[PDB]
Write a protein that binds this ligand. Structure first.
Ligand SMILES: [Zn+2]
Ligand SMILES: [Zn+2]
Lengths: 57, 286, 69, 196, 65, 57, 134, 112, 444, 89, 147, 49
DNA sequence: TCTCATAGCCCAGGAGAAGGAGCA
DNA sequence: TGCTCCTTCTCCTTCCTCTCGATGGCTATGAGA
RNA sequence: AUCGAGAGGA
């Protein structure tokens, strides 16, 4: 065997209330920037398909 | 263009290729792939071509597929027939492998394009310039080493193993068929027992292994660097491990593996490690 | 890297044999399995601890910034 | 992953029928007399004529594919459930790949008997310009293995040429699974915007 | 001499004015000034065919016995 | 990852007292999924395992 | 004309014997065009066995030389004035050349047997039993 | 099928030129012959004029030391050959009408 | 007689005692053979390096001040010429920059632990001619710090012992190959382009995409120079009877009818063109009528061109204001320069016969591709490809930057002359002030 | 189908059911009846001989045998005559 | 068949065989319009049919003495839209998508294809789902966020 | 659609091009929004829950 | 009184639009 | 007088992580020795 | 932090 350079200590990212991009008052992009993860439009389709509009709002 | 083409037997590695976005493009050479960086002294090549019975193109006034055009790497010399053209091609390879004429290097790429219906336009081309991909094979009428390029590969026979050399079927054979692989492809044990996308995954996961970067690690100021403490030589290893010097850089370590569904955790590519193995240095990372 | 202390799976301490293992190779001039049997590693899980190891840590001892070259 | 001596006896004996398979298939599509060797000059000229045309090459490769798949399914239905070295609730490989766990019996057949033909886009391997598929083949060989009929298997070892054509099949598969990721999603977005 | 519908001078080989577009008894050259021929030349004519590619049919495949 | 393309993720480091033990005395280092072998067709891992046990003896 | 000083003046040209055997196109003369390599000696041979017309081999000093016939553009009876090269024979030593002619024609002439001498080496056969070792 | 070698003339007797097919060169022009000594062979230099044109040429230096041609004259009843060493004069023709040219500019400035 | 060995004792003896004569693992140093060979071919070689071969191709730079002296139109004067005779690179030698002490050796550990580059000084031999060598100067101007390749002809670790390679703070198999800039190891990745000096016959939609009557039948060729530069030359078959020619120049292309090029190479007749293209294939009336179209259309569209000199001065008039030699040169020499720099640049001078043969051969193969007697081709196969290396492209780009800087010098002189400053170029302080105002920071 | 709504189908086709009394020979006779026939399908050789009386050229067409396209495409030589008469020239 | 033509001297050369070959690939003898060629297929759970590449209907309405003119099926939509109204093109859409998913033996419920085919017809004719089909729909931001 | 001072080809963003694509506004900031109180990880099997 | 030495700033993939080149 | 078919332009599109750079040039003022 | 360029992963 041989150990790959990918690990678990790098690739995890989380956020509670981080820096906000004050151009649009939207949460910033970046793991070291304390950035949140991105919803896609296909995932908006997935949330309309369940009809869960309260969680969608 | 992304597709693998069968003219690459010996030059590019069919196994070592990344996946995702550069998939199919970003090839890799073989370990017997020399990139010539020199104008080989082929100035005496047209003189010995005139010795071989070629009329000058100044005194010819002809151009057609029935007359084999004899050129040197972008410079027309003369006009012959095709039978004498292939005689001159193979005889010039014979004079290439054997050192009979001093004004003729070992690495002259002799492409005989024969008259074939709906092929490329015929002629005898000689390549002796820079940046020519060269590879050695074994040559049978003199039983020595022969430098061959890719433009002459299609029109000439290159065998695999000596015991299946048949009568007037090949003139060339490999020293070892494992010459057709790359440097990292040969370092995967028993590559011809596996489904080839798993060989491609192996030859791409080998380039991300947190192992041995060097031993001068107290003098460098690299940005990010990774050291593995425990390094071991594989017992199941190829001879090119000994040859090309991966011995200075141990990447991983041997282990005892039971192929078993005992845990219940190993489903769809999972794997389980003994805890005392971790507690006694199972590849400590830095 | 220095030869590790114990076995990876067992825990039988095995690096103490190491230089004497080398003494079975350099001075005694013996075959590999015979010397490994004379050391007494009857389980092969330590036979993969000693045989597979490479002393790269000597090569780290030629770049000493404290030592005046 | 082993057979008996009679299992390998059946394997070798029925693979002895794959000698002139491509020969008689090319004699069929060429529409000349059968029982003609791989060196007849009228045959080699007509094979060059077949090879330079695309659809004629497709017809020849379809006939070759039909005959070699007949030989393949013959060997598979003969040997694979029958002549194993250990039977089904002791052969753990068939115990996995029959109840729908991983794959099918095709994988068991490729491990235990032979791979088959490497169908690059539903046909035989592409050819170089001089009527040669590899540098180790004389021009217009009438071998089915020269067209990529992998008689070897993943247990007894495969030939290098077989491995090379399997690498072609793997690269084709990776291109196909790369191209279909950003392809269907655009159509899916285009007909979710309409129907929301 | 004349090669098909192509003729040049017997000394300089230059391209000439069309003998079916001249009015005199000879042909005057574009660079030199010589007279060749005396206009009693074998007339300008070619023989051309097709190439057995541009005409596809299944009847053509019936000729592939 | 091994040397046959079969990469993987260590889900749990299993205690040695919970390991399966052989008659010779040893316990394995890495237990691997056996069902990965039919689909991926990696038969050479058997060959490397057998030759490595041969070299280890 | 003062064309460059590296050029000098020719002075000797012996006349070409046309009428040593020439009559009205029936003497069956063999006036040839010969394409030799510049590697060999010329004036120490004694005969030239080029009458086989196809296989007129003549090995010169441990190396083979095949002398092939050319029924091509220098000797073909297909095109008029197909001879590219023109036989320029003199009248005396210092004077200019003139085009040779078979009769009172002022036209070029071809040559009766045109050759091509290719350097054929040995290229020996493969030792079959040595290379097919199992 | 053997043909004897009689006489091999060493002096320059006949040199063969080449212009093109259909060329016949009437009596107005002559074949002017010049010499050059590079100490292994002779580059014969061909020159000539007529009423409206002028041809010049030579033998190329990359071929005449790599090639040699023999003029042959055979008689069967004598069974004898005259053999002449011969280079081939390669010469091209220009016109006397080819002495025409434009000035070095067309009188342009930044407005042009 | 075992199959494979560990060689533990030999491994330990090679670890503790590296060989003081020859590097271990001689098969490893075939891996970085192309980069190190393509960098060492810059300085030495069969002619003493190819970059010095390459700077003898850009010619000279000629400028005129304006010179009201006392007619000063055709006798303006002050023919200033700027050229370069020799360029070489020093091995890395550094010191304390003040007072210029003797410079000690430079090791790559001095650039590892400084987080900056690893540079040797670039020097050139600038030939400063005034009015056809009437006042010849040889000014030496340093350029700045140019990066070199590790373990190459311009770094000191090339042929030193592996023992000292340990002693000079490096790996025992430090093969290098990379460049070091800003404390970062970076190299130039190889490329695959079309195989050079080989007429490739292709058919593509992008040929017909350009405009009307553009067939797909095209000979692409990649004409190289002996400094490993190149130039693309494309031959399109038309549906009219002419053959069009593409060549690129300074992010711009042109279209030239090919018979203009044919009679611009050498004065000839049309019978030579017939004898060169079709040869003994005279019964094939297809290509015969194509060549008949070509000759009649050429000598009907412009019958006023009847030698080489008229066509070359026609070219020099048509191509005067883009090659930037317009205030001086005669159009005959302009046309001869463009035919020296575009068409078949693997010969240069004394190529006219062979360039003519090559062009008629490409016309033969193009019309043969039209008639379908040869197969189409593909740049995807390894049959018709070649490898672009790092150091060759490196020397090309350095040639490009040096030529751009010389043209910038000429532009500075042209800006200075129109103000009314010092007329005579003999003056040393004037030239020193001009070189002070210009920026020669090539290394940055 | 669903997104583009294009009329230029790559291979547009039509499936026509036949009656039960129609035999296979009758239906294949109908298939040879329905089929589109090009002129170059019955042209073996086109020979153009120019002669320049001003500039002119004679066209000689060698066709195939009459029974061949008569049985295959249901065409007589006078239909060939009429179609050279009407649309070709 | 051999005949003769005459011309003036305006062009004085053009590629005559190429012109004749360009014409002879456009001269039709018996062209049923918009129909290329019919073949002999095999019935699969059905009666005997005939597959004809090329689509037309008036000439096939004419041949009723040979051909059952009541089960005429096709693959195109626009000819079915012009000929057989609005709902037959819908049935052709459902049958073609059913054919495509039967080629991979992947079962899809017919209610979804029913909904697609009735969504593509809500403005009288065969509506697209590109920018042109979204163009008729009267939602601003839905047209905005697409293209 | 304008003229340009060429040979560098650097279009600075007009308000049209900041509204048209995934890099526009309707997808980069209207629909595709990086969110708060979220997490991302690699996963692992667990047949005990 | 020049030499530096710097401040201050100037190659898919068809579908539409949209209008010329002939026709009742 | 009015109404069609042959050419151009003019349009548009899988998720995540990390690093590494990122205008030349024309003139003022302003001492140094 | 914007634009390019490069690398890597499901
Ligand atoms: Zn142990
Ligand atoms: Zn003339």
């Amino acid at each position: 065997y041989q150990r790959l350079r990918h690990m678990v200590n790098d690739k995890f990212q989380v956020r509670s209330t981080g820096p906000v991009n004050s151009l649009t008052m939207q949460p910033v992009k970046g793991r070291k920037r304390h950035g949140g993860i991105r919803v896609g439009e296909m995932e908006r389709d997935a949330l309309i398909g369940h009809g869960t509009s309260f969680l969608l709002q | 263009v992304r597709k693998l083409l069968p003219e690459s037997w010996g030059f590019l590695c069919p196994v070592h290729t990344p996946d995702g976005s550069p998939c199919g493009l970003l090839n890799h050479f073989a370990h017997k792939c020399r990139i010539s960086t020199q104008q080989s002294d082929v100035s005496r090549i047209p003189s010995i071509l005139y010795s071989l019975g070629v009329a000058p193109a100044s005194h010819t006034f002809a151009a057609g597929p029935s007359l084999c055009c004899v050129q040197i790497d972008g410079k027309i010399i003369g006009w012959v027939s095709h039978e004498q053209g292939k005689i001159i091609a193979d005889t010039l390879r014979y004079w290439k492998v054997e050192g009979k004429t001093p004004g003729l290097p070992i690495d002259l790429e002799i492409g005989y394009v024969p008259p074939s219906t709906r092929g490329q336009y015929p002629g005898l081309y000689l390549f002796g310039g820079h940046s020519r991909m060269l590879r050695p094979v074994r040559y049978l009428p003199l039983d020595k080493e022969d430098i061959v390029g890719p433009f002459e590969q299609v029109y000439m026979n290159i065998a695999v193993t000596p015991q299946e050399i048949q009568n007037n079927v090949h003139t060339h054979v490999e020293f070892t068929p494992t010459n057709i692989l790359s440097i990292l492809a040969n370092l995967t044990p028993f590559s011809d027992f596996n489904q080839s996308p798993r060989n491609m995954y192996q030859c791409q996961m080998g380039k991300q292994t947190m192992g041995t970067p060097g031993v001068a690690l107290c003098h460098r100021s690299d940005n990010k660097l990774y050291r593995l403490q425990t390094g071991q030589t594989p017992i199941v290893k190829a001879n090119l491990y000994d040859d090309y010097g991966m011995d200075n850089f141990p990447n991983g370590f041997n282990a005892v593996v039971a192929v078993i569904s005992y845990t219940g955790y190993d489903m769809d590519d999972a794997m389980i490690i003994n805890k005392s193995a971790d507690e006694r240095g199972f590849g400590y990372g830095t | 890297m220095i030869v590790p202390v114990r076995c990876f799976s067992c825990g039988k301490v095995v690096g103490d044999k190491w230089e004497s293992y080398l003494n079975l190779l350099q001075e005694d001039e013996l075959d590999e399995g015979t010397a490994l049997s004379r050391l007494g590693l009857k389980r092969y899980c330590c036979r993969r601890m000693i045989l597979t190891h490479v002393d790269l840590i000597e090569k780290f001892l030629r770049y000493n910034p404290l030592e005046k070259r | 992953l082993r057979l008996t001596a009679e299992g390998n006896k059946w394997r070798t004996d029925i693979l002895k029928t794959s000698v002139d398979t491509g020969r008689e298939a090319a004699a069929e599509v060429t529409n000349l007399d059968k029982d003609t060797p791989a060196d007849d000059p009228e045959l080699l000229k007509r094979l060059q004529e077949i090879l330079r045309d695309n659809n004629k090459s497709g017809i020849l490769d379809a006939v070759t594919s039909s005959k070699v798949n007949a030989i393949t399914s013959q060997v598979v239905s003969k040997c694979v459930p029958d002549g194993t070295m250990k039977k089904f609730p002791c052969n753990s490989m068939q115990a996995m790949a029959l109840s729908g766990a991983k794959g099918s019996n095709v994988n068991v057949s490729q491990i235990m008997c032979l791979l088959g033909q490497q169908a690059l886009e539903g046909r035989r391997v592409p050819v170089m310009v001089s009527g040669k598929t590899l540098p180790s083949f004389k021009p217009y060989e009438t071998d089915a293995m020269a067209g990529g009929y992998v008689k070897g298997r993943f247990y007894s070892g495969i030939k290098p040429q077989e491995y090379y054509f399997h690498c072609m099949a793997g690269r084709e598969g990776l291109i196909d699974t790369a191209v279909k990721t950003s392809r269907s999603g655009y159509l899916q977005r285009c007909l979710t915007k309409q129907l929301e | 001499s004349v090669v098909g519908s192509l003729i040049f001078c017997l000394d300089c080989g230059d391209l000439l004015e069309n003998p079916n577009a001249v009015l005199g008894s000879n042909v005057e050259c574009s660079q030199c000034k010589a007279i060749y021929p005396k206009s009693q030349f074998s007339n300008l004519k070619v023989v051309t065919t097709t190439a057995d590619d541009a005409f596809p049919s299944s009847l053509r495949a019936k000729k592939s016995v | 990852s091994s040397r046959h393309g079969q990469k993987g993720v260590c889900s749990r480091k299993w205690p040695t007292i919970d390991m399966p033990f052989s008659e010779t005395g040893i316990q394995p280092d890495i237990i691997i999924n056996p069902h990965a072998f039919p689909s991926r067709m990696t038969i050479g891992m058997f060959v490397e395992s057998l030759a490595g046990k041969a070299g280890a003896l | 004309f003062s064309i460059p000083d590296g050029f000098k003046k020719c002075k000797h040209l012996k006349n070409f014997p046309l009428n040593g055997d020439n009559k009205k196109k029936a003497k069956q003369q063999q006036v040839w065009l010969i394409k030799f390599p510049s590697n060999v000696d010329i004036s120490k041979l004694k005969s030239l066995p080029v009458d086989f017309e196809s296989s007129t081999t003549m090995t010169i000093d441990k190396h083979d030389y095949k002398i092939m016939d050319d029924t091509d553009i220098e000797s073909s009876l297909t095109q008029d004035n197909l001879s590219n090269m023109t036989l320029l024979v003199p009248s005396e030593s210092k004077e200019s050349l003139k085009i040779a002619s078979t009769a009172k024609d002022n036209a070029p002439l071809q040559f009766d047997k045109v050759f091509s001498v290719s350097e054929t080496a040995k290229i020996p056969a493969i030792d079959y039993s040595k290379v097919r070792v199992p | 099928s053997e043909i004897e070698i009689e006489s091999v003339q060493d002096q320059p007797s006949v040199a063969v030129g080449s212009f093109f097919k259909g060329f016949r060169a009437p009596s107005d022009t002559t074949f002017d012959l010049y010499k050059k000594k590079k100490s292994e062979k002779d580059e014969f230099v061909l020159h000539g004029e007529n009423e409206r044109l002028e041809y010049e040429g030579y033998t190329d230096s990359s071929s005449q030391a790599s090639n040699q041609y023999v003029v042959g004259l055979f008689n069967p009843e004598k069974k004898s050959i005259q053999l002449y060493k011969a280079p081939v004069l390669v010469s091209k023709v220009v016109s006397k009408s080819s002495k025409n040219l434009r000035g070095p500019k067309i009188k342009s400035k930044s407005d042009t | 007689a075992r199959t494979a060995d560990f060689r533990t004792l030999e491994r330990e003896s090679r670890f503790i005692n590296p060989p003081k004569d020859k590097s271990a693992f001689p098969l490893l140093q075939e891996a970085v053979q192309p980069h190190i060979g393509s960098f060492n071919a810059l300085t030495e070689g069969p002619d003493g390096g190819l970059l010095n071969l390459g700077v003898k191709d850009i010619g000279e730079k000629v400028i005129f001040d304006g010179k009201p002296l006392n007619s000063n139109s055709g006798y303006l004067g002050n023919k200033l010429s700027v050229s370069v005779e020799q360029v070489s690179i020093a091995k890395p030698m550094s010191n304390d920059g003040v007072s210029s002490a003797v410079e000690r050796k430079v090791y790559p550990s001095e650039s590892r632990q400084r987080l900056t580059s690893y540079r040797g000084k670039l020097l050139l031999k600038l030939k400063w001619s005034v009015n056809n060598g009437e006042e010849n100067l040889f000014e030496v101007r340093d350029c700045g710090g140019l990066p070199v390749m590790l373990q190459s002809n311009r770094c000191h670790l090339n042929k030193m012992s592996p023992y000292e390679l340990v002693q000079h703070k490096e790996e025992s198999d430090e093969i290098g190959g990379y460049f070091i800039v800003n404390g970062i190891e970076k190299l130039i990745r190889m490329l695959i382009v079309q195989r050079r000096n080989h007429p490739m016959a292709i058919i593509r939609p992008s040929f017909a995409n350009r405009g009307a009557s553009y067939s797909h039948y095209g000979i692409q060729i990649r004409s190289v120079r002996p400094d490993q530069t190149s130039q693309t030359n494309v031959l399109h078959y038309l549906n009219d009877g002419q053959v069009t020619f593409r060549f690129s120049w300074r992010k711009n292309e042109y279209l030239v009818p090919v018979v203009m090029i044919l009679k611009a190479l050498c004065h000839t007749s049309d019978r030579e063109i017939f004898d060169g293209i079709i040869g003994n294939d005279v019964k094939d009336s297809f290509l015969t009528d194509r060549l008949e179209l070509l000759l009649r259309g050429f000598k009907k569209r412009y019958p006023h061109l009847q030698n080489r000199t008229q066509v070359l001065q026609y070219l020099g008039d048509k191509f005067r204001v883009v090659f930037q030699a317009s205030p001086d040169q005669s159009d005959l020499e302009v046309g001869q320069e463009v035919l020296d720099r575009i068409v078949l640049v693997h010969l240069g001078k004394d190529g006219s016969q062979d360039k003519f043969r090559m062009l008629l051969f490409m016309i033969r193969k193009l019309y043969s591709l039209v008639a379908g007697e040869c197969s189409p081709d593909n740049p995807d196969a390894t049959q018709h490809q070649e490898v672009l290396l790092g150091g060759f492209l490196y020397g090309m780009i350095l040639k490009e930057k040096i030529d751009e800087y010389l043209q910038n010098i000429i532009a500075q002189v042209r800006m200075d002359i129109n103000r009314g400053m010092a007329i005579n170029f003999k003056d040393k302080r004037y030239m020193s002030r001009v070189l002070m105002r210009v920026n020669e920071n090539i290394g940055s | 189908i669903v997104m583009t709504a294009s009329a230029a189908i790559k291979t547009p086709q039509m499936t026509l059911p036949i009656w039960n009394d129609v035999s296979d020979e009758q239906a294949d006779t109908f298939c040879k009846s329905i089929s589109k026939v090009l002129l170059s399908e019955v042209i073996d050789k086109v020979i153009v001989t120019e002669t320049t009386a001003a500039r002119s050229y004679v066209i000689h067409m060698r066709f195939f045998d009459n029974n061949e396209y008569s049985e295959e495409y249901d065409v007589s030589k006078e239909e060939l005559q009429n179609v050279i008469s009407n649309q070709f020239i | 068949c051999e005949f003769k033509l005459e011309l003036a001297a305006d062009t004085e050369k053009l590629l005559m065989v190429n012109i004749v070959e360009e014409i002879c690939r456009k001269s039709i003898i018996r062209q049923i319009p918009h129909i290329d060629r019919c073949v002999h297929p095999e019935p699969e759970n059905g009666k005997r049919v005939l597959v004809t590449e090329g689509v037309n209907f008036q000439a096939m309405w004419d041949q009723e003495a040979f051909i059952d003119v009541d089960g005429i099926t096709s693959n195109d939509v626009a000819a079915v839209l012009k000929t057989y109204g609005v709902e037959a093109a819908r049935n052709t859409i459902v049958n073609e998508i059913n054919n495509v998913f039967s080629r991979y033996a992947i079962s899809v419920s017919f209610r979804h294809l029913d909904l697609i085919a009735d969504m593509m017809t809500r403005q009288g004719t065969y509506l697209a789902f590109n920018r042109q089909g979204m163009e008729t729909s009267t939602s601003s931001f839905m047209k905005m966020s697409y293209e | 659609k304008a003229q340009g001072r060429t040979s560098g080809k650097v279009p600075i963003p007009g308000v049209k091009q900041a509204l048209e694509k995934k890099e526009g506004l309707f997808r980069k900031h209207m629909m595709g929004k990086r969110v708060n109180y979220a997490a991302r990880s690699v996963i692992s099997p667990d047949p005990n829950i």
